[PDB]
Each structure stands twice: as structure tokens, then as C-alpha cells.
Amino acid sequence: DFRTLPISQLVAPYAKDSREPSVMIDDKFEAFMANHRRFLAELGDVRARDVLEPLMQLQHIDANFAHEL
């Protein structure tokens, strides 16, 4: 299937790159990256019920979707 571009694909070219950035990392950038890591972890936590329960609640107000289901 099709998804948005993953970051690992974009940082793959720097796999063997052993370099130090010119600009020293500051506190705000570190907090930004920590928040991003938290969001990325939260992204991959979708269970089956998250999709299935709303469908079996919403089928009770529309008959065409119940037919489809």
C-alpha cells in the first residue's frame, strides 16, 4: 500500500557518515526531537478495536453501510 515518505529512507544516505555538525545542538532542538520521538512511538499503536468498534456502532443509523458491512 501507499504511505507518506518515511524519515529512515531520507537519512539512509548518511548511514556511513561520521561527521560533526558545525552548529552545536541546543536544548530547544533536543526537546523538539524528544517530542517528535514520542509522537512517532504513538503513531504505531493502532489496534483492531480502534477501527472495528466505531463501525459496529455507526451501522445502526445507516442501512446502506450495514448492507456494505
Partner 1 sequence: DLAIQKLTEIRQYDPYYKRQALNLIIAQTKLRVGFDSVPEDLPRLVRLQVEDLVKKNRDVDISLFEVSDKERSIAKKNEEQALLKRLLKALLYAESIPEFKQEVDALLVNLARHFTLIEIGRSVIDMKKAYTPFDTKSGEGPLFIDNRVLSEAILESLANENLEVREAAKRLIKEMHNAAVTVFGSPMHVPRMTFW
Residues 7-19: b if buried by 16+ CB within 10 A, e if exposed: eeeeeeeeeeeee
User: How near is the Cβ of 27 to partner 1 at its closest, in Å?
Assistant: 11
How far is residue 61's CA from residue 69's CA, in Å, rounded to a whole number?
A: 13
DSSP structure class, residue 25? P
Residues touching partner 1, count (CB under 8 A): 45
| Residue 54 identity (one-letter amino acid) | P
Residue 69 contacts partner 1 per CB under 8 A = no
For partner 1, the binding residue among 9, 27, 63, 67 (CB under 8 A) is: 9
User: How near is the Cβ of 58 to partner 1 at its closest, in Å?
Assistant: 6
Q: Which positions touch partner 1 (CB under 8 A)?
A: 1-14, 17, 19-23, 25-26, 28-30, 32-33, 35-37, 39-40, 43-44, 46, 50-51, 53-55, 57-58, 61-62, 65
